[PDB]
Amino acid sequence: STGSATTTPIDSLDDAYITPVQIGTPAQTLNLDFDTGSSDLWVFSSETTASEVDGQTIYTPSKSTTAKLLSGATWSISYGDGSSSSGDVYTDTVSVGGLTVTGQAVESAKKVSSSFTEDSTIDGLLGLAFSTLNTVSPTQQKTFFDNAKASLDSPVFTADLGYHAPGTYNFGFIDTTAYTGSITYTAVSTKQGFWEWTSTGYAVGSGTFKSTSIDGIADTGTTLLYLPATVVSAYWAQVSGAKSSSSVGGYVFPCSATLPSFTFGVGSARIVIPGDYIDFGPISTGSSSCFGGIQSSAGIGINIFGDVALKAAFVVFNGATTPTLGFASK
Secondary structure, X not given: OOEEEEEEEOOOOOOOEEEEEEEOOOOEEEEEEEEOOOOOEEEOEOOOOHHHOOOOOOEOHHHOOOXXXXXXXXXXXXXXXXXXXXXXXXXXXXXXXOEEEEEEEEEEEEEEOHHHHOOOOOOEEEEOOOHHHOOOEOOXXXXXXXXXXHHOOOOEEEEEOOOOOOEEEEEOOOOOOOOOOOOEEEEXXXXXXXXXXXXXEEEEOOOOOEEEEEEEEEOOOOOOEEEOHHHHHHHHOOOOOOEEEOOOOEXXXXXXXXXXXXXXXXXXXXXXXXXXXXXXXXXXXXXXXXXXXXXXXXXXXXXXXXXXXXXXXXXXXXOOOOOEEXXXXX
16 A cells, blocks of 8 residues: 655745644544654544644544544653643544554544644644654554554655645655655664664855764654754854854844755765755844754754755655665755
8 A cells, every 4th residue: 555645834934744634434634743753643632621722623533433542541742842742542543645544543632732732733743753752651552654564565654845835745655756866775773763864964055065974863843954063053154144042042144144055965965955945034023033944953962854954855764674764856
């Protein structure tokens, strides 16, 4: 089997991407944030504290003939940005782009933090990291991908995120028309539960490539590119007037600037992030200070190849017995 679904930016900055997901019988379609940095499929629901729901579409398990309470199971998750959610668990039928999993754990939120409430466009998350990170207790649950894997034509999924445009998540096949040149594969460590890999270096604009190992994670659920302070300083030094602002929370730059590209290495291959991908617009409405899309990972504890990086590539998440990651230009 295979599946193919379009993923759409939630706003004009590509802050996140939503993908329609069918849950239950008859189908209830919710728009979920596919997150290769976590491993819980959770939804706003009829159980979510009413004051914490503001415009989201909810899953109502009592209206699904295939929903079953997973008795005694609870979940609770905290994300890198400080947001969180928790609740109980149902199993139900879940379909993405025509690919169906029966008995998928659907984590129903009883509580969500303010950042989730305030984002009316995201109805929940669909985790695509390794199932070892799943938070369900006392019986850990499998991700949608892990459940689908055996049935797929090939044990892979691909992320093809758009810049200010829709893109695609495919399951079970590699669309050879969706990228240019060849796909370069690189080793993955699953030790921390992430799609963790080592970039071979970087360049800023038309500058020379610096060969240096940068361990980080491929994370579709993180907006920006978070890299070591040395790398990030080298980038922003090429933008007149750019500075790190403790009050704003990162590097800002004059909105009048033209940003240089940023290149990262994948083995001997190179992925080029155009400068425009690094512009996240005014820090507040009407400001002439703009927020940068490349930020320091110092004090996160991990480097994160988030959407800024991933949307410059066609990315293969190869879930074979020994997982790997592939990157192609597009």
